[PDB]
Amino acid sequence: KVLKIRYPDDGEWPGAPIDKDGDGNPEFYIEINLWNILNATGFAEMTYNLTSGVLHYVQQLDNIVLRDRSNWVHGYPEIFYGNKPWNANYATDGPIPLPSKVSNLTDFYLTISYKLEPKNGLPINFAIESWLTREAWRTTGINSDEQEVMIWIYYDGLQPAGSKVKEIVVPIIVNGTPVNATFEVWKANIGWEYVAFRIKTPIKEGTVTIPYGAFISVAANISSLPNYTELYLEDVEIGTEFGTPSTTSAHLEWWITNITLTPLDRPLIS
Numbered sequence: 001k002v003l004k005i006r007y008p009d010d011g012e013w014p015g016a017p018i019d020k021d022g023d024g025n026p027e028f029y030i031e032i033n034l035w036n037i038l039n040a041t042g043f044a045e046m047t048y049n050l051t052s053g054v055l056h057y058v059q060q061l062d063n064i065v066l067r068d069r070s071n072w073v074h075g076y077p078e079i080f081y082g083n084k085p086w087n088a089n090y091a092t093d094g095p096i097p098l099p100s101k102v103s104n105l106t107d108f109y110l111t112i113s114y115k116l117e118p119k120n121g122l123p124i125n126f127a128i129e130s131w132l133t134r135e136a137w138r139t140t141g142i143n144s145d146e147q148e149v150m151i152w153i154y155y156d157g158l159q160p161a162g163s164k165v166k167e168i169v170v171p172i173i174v175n176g177t178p179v180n181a182t183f184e185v186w187k188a189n190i191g192w193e194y195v196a197f198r199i200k201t202p203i204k205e206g207t208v209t210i211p212y213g214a215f216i217s218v219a220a221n222i223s224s225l226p227n228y229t230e231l232y233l234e235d236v237e238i239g240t241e242f243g244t245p246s247t248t249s250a251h252l253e254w255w256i257t258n259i260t261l262t263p264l265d266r267p268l269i270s
């Protein structure tokens with residue numbers, strides 16, 4: 001009834017599928033994803049109640065030493081839908097068929113209910129991201145002619161990679177009320193093209209719905225990549241990146257109670 005993964009007990013790379021009907025196709029996949037920590041004292045644990053659907057993350061890390069300080073952040077504990085292109089983990093039991101080419105995909109709303117509790121000023125975000133790859137089912141990383149798109153709906157103490165490009169309006173729903181929100185658009189070249197959308201009014205807790213194609217359309221429009229609409233939207237990842245190279249302790253708790261992808265009857269890109 002409860003799935004639990006724990007670092008370092010389960011190794012340096014704990015993760016697991018959420019497969020509530022036991023049908024061998026996960027609905028979501030969870031990873032502690034401390035991808036830039038070489039060593040730390042303490043623990044991180046992610047637990048998922050299969051009946052309530054609550055995902056609860058508890059992290060108490062100290063003495064943190066990074067694998068490569070140029071990566072900046074320490075990790076990105078997360079839950080995702082689709083095929084994460086950095087490894088062989090996937091989740092495809094859901095209404096949106098990911099991966100799909102961006103030219104063939106419907107737009108969709110993403111709704112998340114959550115609450116974040118970083119401790120003592122830990123730098124952090126709550127970031128949704130997708131990878132856009134040239135092949136349909138990538139599992140071995142990302143090339144220079146591909147894109148990473150992130151959407152930050154909370155942040156404290158972190159800035160996206162690269163340079164600020166512009167600000168856009170995106171109509172979103174926050175705590176049941178439709179609102180016009182502003183996102184800063186950032187672009188970088190970090191081994192691949194990176195585009196990030198950082199909300200100007202961070203939301204630390206509640207229920208937020210965003211229209212995914214508002215973001216992908218802007219990422220396509222500002223892209224320097226050729227043949228953008230032939231890329232595959234591999235996945236939708238939701239997690240909290242945390243830490244900086246001068247962060248040595250990172251205590252954080254959060255909860256996610258619902259994630260829903262709702263198809264729209266319109267193209268993803270407009």
Ligand SMILES: OC[C@H]1O[C@@H](O[C@H]2[C@H](O)[C@@H](O)[C@H](O[C@H]3[C@H](O)[C@@H](O)[C@H](O[C@H]4[C@H](O)[C@@H](O)[C@H](O)O[C@@H]4CO)O[C@@H]3CO)O[C@@H]2CO)[C@H](O)[C@@H](O)[C@@H]1O
Nearest residue numbers: 013033035071073075076086087088148150161190194241
């Ligand atoms: O060899 C040990 C172990 O490796 C596992 O594979 C690791 C790769 O080694 C590691 O490079 C990869 O890290 C990814 C990570 O999964 C992504 O979440 C992260 O995304 C970053 C993004 O790169 C940034 O630009 C943006 O700002 O932040 C996001 C979120 O922080 O990117 C890094 C790549 O740099 O993770 C793999 C595991 O998922 C093997 O799978 C295992 O078998 C080996 O034992």
Ligand SMILES: [Ca+2]
Nearest residue numbers: 019023025093
């Ligand atoms: Ca399933």
Ligand SMILES: [Ca+2]
Nearest residue numbers: 084087088089
């Ligand atoms: Ca994968």
